[PDB]
Ligand binder design. Structure first.
Ligand SMILES: Nc1ncnc2c([C@@H]3O[C@H](CO)[C@@H](O)[C@H]3O)n[nH]c12
Ligand SMILES: Nc1ncnc2c([C@@H]3O[C@H](CO)[C@@H](O)[C@H]3O)n[nH]c12
Lengths: 229, 229
């Protein structure tokens, strides 16, 4: 079995590599470094994409085409858009949207591109596994919509737009693109985020403070999912 | 050799398929249909990505990893940001930027993502070929910066931002992401656009009127380049 594990930043995959604690071969391709290891009966391929939609689209496509991963699990951090998502809380994305897509000039709904859809779904199977583990381990896992775009959101006005337009609970910069690629290749995908900030005026400072811890929270949970695969 | 040829829309590649006039094999992959043909001892792979950065990133990566193309030529339409670029005019991109990338919360310049760059360059050799053909055929080929993002621009305010911030001459939704993927894999890339609109309040109407004609103008030029490869 081959499992792809993705983060956006080095900080998000360092805990992952450490948690598995196996030897990894480093393989460069398309401007990324892939870490290939064997963990029990599974081949694991770990990489960070670098930030944003284009980066994450390329890395996920490489993981699937060049390494043949049969599942993709993404772990990282995000901004909270709703009161009951607190710093360090975990969210599993059930649907994702690209919130910065705008073809309204042609009277398309926001987030929509012809020959596509506004919302992408993730793996029912992996999401159920996440919920099962969280219930068993007394972890307060939330689920809901994640909005992805190529801007770091640090504005009350944008937060209000995301909730009202897309019913999003969190905002980040890679989830929708990773899940889109996986869907096009028929590869099950799970997107896990731990809250690092509130996507508001001081989100940058909060992100700087909490990146390491929030990244660890996500990584540890992702590791527990792989242990059950 | 193996040449990849890309457009964003069906309208942009139908002229290309007709121009080559050979039999193509249709090969589905990653939600795209790739048209594989042989033309004067060159293997040509033609596809349209569908609109936007994620779509075009995926398609370009598939073309390179799954088909092994050695160069990529992109043909399509764009909005003009400057007075001397008129509807139907041809532009070859010298550099491209993702104009909607915003990590200003971390004090990064607009368009910049850490571990990347604001501007991406295109193929010196292909751009020179384009210029030689234009000169030989007495075609008024322009060169300049192209800004790419996931919005159809139809606003004087946004036009002013693009010209001021990035010194862009035209705006579209795929160029920067195609050239980005090509650079990461070391694949020479040329991006050609024919102007379909002025990226202003009436841009949607202009695009609707001129998409087909402008798409044909760009396709014919791309064909001329492949004929010299
Ligand atoms: N408020 C916010 N807005 C957008 N992205 C993020 C993120 C995630 O952290 C990184 C911030 O650039 C990026 O990978 C994104 O996915 N955290 N908080 C965010
Ligand atoms: N004013 C404009 N703004 C953004 N993109 C475009 C385009 C191109 O045409 C398509 C418009 O959806 C898309 O593929 C884009 O690359 N034409 N005019 C444009």
């Amino acid at each position: 079995q081959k499992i792809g594990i993705l983060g956006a930043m080095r900080e998000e995959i360092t805990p992952i590599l450490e948690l598995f604690g196996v030897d990894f071969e480093e393989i460069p391709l398309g401007g990324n470094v892939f870490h290939k290891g064997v963990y029990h009966n599974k081949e694991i391929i770990v990489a960070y994409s670098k930030i944003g939609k284009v980066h994450s689209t390329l890395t996920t496509t490489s993981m699937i085409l060049a390494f043949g991963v049969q599942k993709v699990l993404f772990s990282g951090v995000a901004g909270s858009l709703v009161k009951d998502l607190k710093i360090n809380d975990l969210l599993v994305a059930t649907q994702l949207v690209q919130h910065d897509v705008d073809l309204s000039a042609f009277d398309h709904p926001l987030g929509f591109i012809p020959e596509s859809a506004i919302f992408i779904e993730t793996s029912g199977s992996l999401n159920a596994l996440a919920k099962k583990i969280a219930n068993e381990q007394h972890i307060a896992l939330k689920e809901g919509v994640i909005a992805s775009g190529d801007q770091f959101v640090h504005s009350k006005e944008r937060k209000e737009f995301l909730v009202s337009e897309f019913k999003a609970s969190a905002v980040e910069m890679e989830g929708a693109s990773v899940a889109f690629v996986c869907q096009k290749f028929g590869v099950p995908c799970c997107v896990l985020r731990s809250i690092s900030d509130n996507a508001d005026e001081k989100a940058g400072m909060s992100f700087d403070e909490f990146l390491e811890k929030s990244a660890h929270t996500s990584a540890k949970f992702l590791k527990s999912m792989v242990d059950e695969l």
